[PDB]
Design an enzyme around this catalytic site. Structure first.
Site, PDB file in Angstrom:
ATOM      1  N   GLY A   1       0.779  -1.224   0.000  1.00  0.00           N
ATOM      2  CA  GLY A   1       0.000   0.000   0.000  1.00  0.00           C
ATOM      3  C   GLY A   1       0.811   1.274   0.000  1.00  0.00           C
TER       4      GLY A   1
ATOM      5  N   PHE B   1       1.760   3.208   2.827  1.00  0.00           N
ATOM      6  CA  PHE B   1       2.896   3.187   3.738  1.00  0.00           C
ATOM      7  C   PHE B   1       3.205   1.795   4.338  1.00  0.00           C
ATOM      8  CE2 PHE B   1       0.848   7.567   4.498  1.00  0.00           C
ATOM      9  CZ  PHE B   1       1.770   8.354   3.837  1.00  0.00           C
TER      10      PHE B   1
ATOM     11  N   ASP C   1      -6.782   9.661  -4.401  1.00  0.00           N
ATOM     12  CA  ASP C   1      -6.211   8.405  -4.957  1.00  0.00           C
ATOM     13  C   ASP C   1      -7.272   7.271  -4.943  1.00  0.00           C
ATOM     14  OD1 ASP C   1      -4.032   6.167  -5.455  1.00  0.00           O
ATOM     15  OD2 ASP C   1      -3.983   6.063  -3.235  1.00  0.00           O
TER      16      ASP C   1
END
Ligand code: ADP
Ligand code: 6VT
Ligand code: AMP
Ligand code: AMP
Ligand code: CL
Ligand code: CL
Ligand code: CL
Ligand code: CL
Lengths: 160, 281, 363
Positions: free
Chosen positions: C16, C18, C130
């Site tokens: 993903g 982070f 996003d």
């Protein structure tokens, strides 16, 4: 009380010996260049070493402790603050002008009905200072603010 | 019924998005009354910049007061109204006879507000948050009466229950000048004056609201005109009518008071929004 | 067996914003979860420590059938584990790759579900920037699930966002132009491309030549295949507006005749801003500083265009704060904006604070 043990390096077989397991070769699971093991440890000091492919080592990046007998083992201080997420995140935390967004050019005062009642503003235009041209030496000032789930647009008639 | 008021917080009655007009005490008083007209508001709080607090409220009563207190003639200017600050006039009107600001918190009950209206004999009550110190909304009788009618899901005659003033009713005639009429609102401290014809029959009603038309049309310089001439720019009840129907009649017209009239349309008493909320307290 | 909670960590699902995401099968029940792993040392390396704190706070109280639920956050001394709901279906993107485009009826079903989630976020002042079919996962019963809140952000009263985050094909013109934005509008543009992708099986804005992609995006010009229903073409034309002020609102989409069809029950006197001085922006900043100090106010210079000023009240003896920001209107004029920062009246104290400055300033 879970603690993560990770070996960043390669190997055919990697093990973890520690004070917590009476220095027994517990095996680590490989993913990529990482060999892990998660285990519950009491909040205190714990010493550990790795048995990476027939060689005893410590993680150089992790804190060590050299013995009176010249034994180098890694050390781990599992603190109470490491257990609770918000306590851990707290301890962890220690040109040209912008183009004016068109949203600020939309007011609720300009755009029958009740003169007091007004449309619901966009969150983005709240707390911003608006003013009407100074006519007759008296300044007009305005701004929409919110108190709980209700909004109030205050008009100030102040002489200048 | 009153138990409903003692429970419901002021905040619930504040509309989703409103407009509040505040005048600094240092603003010229004529500019202040014209701003009440342009913003379409019947009351505005007053911020004393030197005191750093809301010292009061500017209403139509102040305009009626300046007008009657200072009108000399139709031929001469009301030089005071024309050039006087709100503070200069606040000092004249309230010299030794001083009255402080009456306000309510949004967290306080609807009862506390209704009781505070009758307690101080006022029609406009500002709502102020303690921590912020901001004036949020001006609570009126009409708004409380509206929310209460929307909540009703007593039942005797207006003569039986006996609610309101029925003795020595302040009135004007067709020919009565505005100045004379303003002077009635002054000495009596009443909101509207029923207009009567050649006989005891009531043909119209001149309210404090009909006085803002003078500010709006900028005609205040001639108060010599008859009340009918003044009302050229643009409802009764009976003693045998039920209280629930009278409350319904007032809200299905959004009017402050109804006239208790006789068979031949002659005034017999009055019933104000103020009185109804008092009975239910 | 690598255990966390009581789940045995398995294969990496993907990586993903982070950190890595892994499967977790319960020791006894066999129930499967998705575990995001955030190294404490790596999260402090990027200054995202704050972002993660918020990201958790939000997701920990959210509960919508089309947003991946966050079950528990487990903190260890080394790393942080985010235990979340697992969905077998995988990416919506891969679904649209293997199978083609979706039939009007099926596209609509999924678009209703995504938008529902998008609305729920915005209703909670959270804006998941996003938003791509890659970040829309599906379950065994074909239900959309919004998932990468790593690039999400809060919506604050009177404040704009700046971060130009997200994939270029899904990014809004203002995002690619790197301009300021409110937040919901950029999710609507993304929802618009997701709708296009669902109906057509391709991207509306796409090119190998990056400059011609960005030209098309800022020119809001795309192809509408013959098979497309004019009603959905009307919805797409409204959602893919280059001007945010002309863009569809969730309310405008909800009202649309294509959206509404078979929609399930369970989902859902001229005023002026500040003052406009035409001088040099470096000189206006020097002028406002010469004006603020001439009023005995304490401040803090953040950006060379953003200032945070405080004033000591001489009567209530209370400190009152307000922020100043200089934007650019024309190619010719610039304007100075006054924002309020949360006794006597706070609102009036703000008005009086601003007024003084204006009385000694240009337009
Ligand atoms: N909350 C208040 N505090 C102090 N004075 C007030 C307040 N509200 C009104 N007044 C004063 O009371 C007087 C009568 O006002 P009011 O009956 O409310 O007017 P109106 O009938 O137009 O609403 C005025 O002199 C006004 O200044
Ligand atoms: O990868 C990264 O950057 C990591 C950073 N911090 C981590 C902490 C852990 Cl625990 C793991 C991990 C977890 C499970 C596995 C398994 O797949 C289950 C058996 C093998 C492998 C690695 C990975 C990272
Ligand atoms: N024209 C009037 N003459 C006499 N009393 C009145 C008149 N209008 C109202 N009242 C009374 O004055 C009080 C306050 O009324 P109001 O100012 O209309 O809210 C109430 O007791 C009313 O019944
Ligand atoms: N009893 C009444 N019958 C008819 N109109 C009334 C009555 N009382 C007030 N009004 C009208 O209401 C307006 C004043 O409003 P207010 O003082 O809020 O009631 C004026 O246009 C009056 O003519
Ligand atoms: Cl991935
Ligand atoms: Cl399985
Ligand atoms: Cl599933
Ligand atoms: Cl695709």
């Amino acid at each position: 009380r879970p603690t993560v043990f990770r070996w960043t390096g390669g190997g055919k077989e990697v093990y973890l010996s520690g004070s917590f397991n009476n220095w027994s070769k517990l095996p680590l699971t490989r993913d990529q260049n990482n060999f892990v093991a998660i285990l519950d440890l009491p909040e205190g000091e714990h010493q550990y070493k790795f048995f990476v492919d027939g060689q005893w080592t410590h993680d150089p990046s992790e804190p060590i402790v050299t013995s009176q007998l010249g034994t180098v083992n890694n050390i781990i201080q599992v603190k109470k603050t490491d257990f609770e997420v918000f306590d851990a995140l707290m301890v962890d935390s220690q040109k040209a002008p912008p183009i004016l967004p068109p949203h600020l050019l939309q007011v609720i005062l300009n755009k029958s009905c009740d003169p007091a009642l007004l449309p619901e503003p966009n969150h983005v235009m709240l707390n911003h200072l608006y003013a009407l041209s100074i006519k007759d030496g008296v300044m007009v000032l305005s701004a929409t603010h919110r108190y709980k789930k209700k909004y109030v647009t205050t008009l100030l008639y102040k002489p200048i | 019924y009153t138990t409903f008021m003692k429970s419901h917080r002021c905040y619930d009655l504040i509309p989703t998005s409103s407009k509040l007009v505040v005048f600094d005490t240092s603003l010229q008083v004529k500019k202040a009354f014209f701003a009440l007209v342009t913003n379409g508001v019947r009351a505005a709080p007053l911020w004393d910049s030197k005191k750093q607090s809301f010292v009061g409220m500017l209403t139509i009563t102040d305009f009626i007061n300046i007008l009657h207190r200072y009108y000399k003639s139709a031929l001469v200017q009301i030089y005071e109204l024309e050039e006087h600050k709100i503070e200069t006039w606040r000092e004249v009107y309230l010299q030794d006879s001083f009255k402080p600001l009456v306000c309510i918190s949004p967290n306080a009950s609807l009862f506390d507000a209704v009781s505070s209206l009758i307690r101080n004999k006022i029609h406009r009550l500002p709502v102020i948050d303690p921590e912020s110190g901001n004036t949020l909304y001006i609570l009126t009788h009409k708004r409380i009466l509206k929310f209460l009618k929307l909540f009703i899901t007593m039942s005797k005659s207006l003569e039986e229950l006996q609610i309101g003033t029925y003795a020595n009713i302040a009135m004007v005639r067709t020919t009565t000048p505005v100045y004379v009429a303003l002077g009635i609102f002054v000495q009596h401290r009443v909101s509207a004056l029923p207009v009567v014809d050649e006989k005891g029959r009531v043909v119209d009603i001149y309210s404090k609201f009909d006085v803002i038309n003078l500010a709006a049309e900028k005609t205040y310089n001639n108060l010599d005109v008859s009340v009918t001439k003044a009302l050229q720019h643009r409802l009764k009840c009976y003693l045998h009518e039920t209280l629930e129907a009278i409350i319904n009649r007032l809200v299905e017209a959004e009017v402050h008071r109804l006239v208790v009239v006789d068979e031949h349309d002659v005034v017999k008493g009055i019933v104000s929004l103020s009185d109804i909320l008092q009975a239910l307290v | 067996r690598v255990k966390i909670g009581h789940y045995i960590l398995g294969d990496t699902l993907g990586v993903g914003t982070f950190g890595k995401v892994k499967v977790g099968k319960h020791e006894l029940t066999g129930h499967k979860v998705a575990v995001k792993i955030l190294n404490r040392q790596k999260i402090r390396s990027l200054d995202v420590v704050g972002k993660i704190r918020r990201e958790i706070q939000n997701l920990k109280l959210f509960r919508h059938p089309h947003i991946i639920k966050l079950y528990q956050v487990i903190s260890t001394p080394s790393d942080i584990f985010m235990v979340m709901e697992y969905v077998s279906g995988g990416e919506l993107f891969d679904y649209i790759c293997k199978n083609g485009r979706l039939d009007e009826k099926e596209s609509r079903r999924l678009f209703q579900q995504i938008l529902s989630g998008v609305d729920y976020c915005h209703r909670h002042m959270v804006v998941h920037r996003d938003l791509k079919p890659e970040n829309v996962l599906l379950d065994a019963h074909m239900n959309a699930k919004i998932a990468d809140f790593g690039l999400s952000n809060m919506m604050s009263d009177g404040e704009f966002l700046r971060t130009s985050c997200g994939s270029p094909n899904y990014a809004a013109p203002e995002v690619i132009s790197g301009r300021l934005y409110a937040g919901p509008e950029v999710d609507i543009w993304s929802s618009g491309v997701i709708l296009y992708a669902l109906l057509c099986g391709t991207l509306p804005f796409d090119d190998d030549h990056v400059p011609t992609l960005f030209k098309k995006i800022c020119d809001g010009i795309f192809y509408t295949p013959q098979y497309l229903n004019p009603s959905v073409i009307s919805l797409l034309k409204h959602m893919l507006q280059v001007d945010p002020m002309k863009r569809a609102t969730i309310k405008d989409i909800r009202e649309h005749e294509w959206f509404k069809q078979d929609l399930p029950k369970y989902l859902f006197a001229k005023w002026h801003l500040g003052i406009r001085s035409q001088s040099r922006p470096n000189d206006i900043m020097a002028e406002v500083c010469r004006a603020i100090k001439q009023l005995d106010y304490e401040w803090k210079v953040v950006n060379p265009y953003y200032l945070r000023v405080r004033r000591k009240n001489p009567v209530t003896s209370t400190f009152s704060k307000m922020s100043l920001q200089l934007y650019q209107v024309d190619s010719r004029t610039y304007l100075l904006d006054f924002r309020s920062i949360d006794p006597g009246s706070h609102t009036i104290e703000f008005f009086e604070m601003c007024a003084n400055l204006i009385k000694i300033l240009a337009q």
